[PDB]
Amino acid sequence: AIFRFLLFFQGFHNWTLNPFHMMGVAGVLGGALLCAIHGATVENTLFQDGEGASTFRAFNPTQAEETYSMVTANRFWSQIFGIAFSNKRWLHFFMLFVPVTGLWMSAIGVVGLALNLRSYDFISQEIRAAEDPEFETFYTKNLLLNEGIRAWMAPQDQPHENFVFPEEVLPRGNAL
Ligand X SMILES: CCCCCCCCCCCCCCCC(=O)OC[C@H](COP(=O)(O)OC[C@@H](O)CO)OC(=O)CCCCCCCCCCCCCCC
Which residues are part of a known binding site? 21, 38, 85, 92
**Letter string b/e over residues 99-111, b meaning 16 or more CB atoms within 10 A of that residue's CB:** bebbeebbeebee
Binding ligand X (rule: CB under 6 A), the pick from 44, 78, 137, 158 is 44
Residue span binding ligand X (CB under 6 A) among the ranges 18-26, 84-92, 146-154, 157-165: 84-92
* 55 near ligand X (CB under 6 A): yes
Q: What are phi and psi of 99, to 5 degrees?
A: -70, -30
State the number of CA atoms in the 13 A half-sphere of 70 facing the CB: 9
Site for ligand CLA, rule CB under 6 A: 101, 105
* 104 near other proteins (CB under 8 A): no
Least distance in angstroms from the C-beta of 139 to other proteins: 4
Task: Name the binding residues for chlorophyll a.
Answer: 21
* 52 near other proteins (CB under 8 A): yes
Residue 49 contacts residue 58 (beta carbons within 8 Å): yes
Residue 112 contacts residue 118 (beta carbons within 8 Å): yes
* 119 near other proteins (CB under 8 A): yes
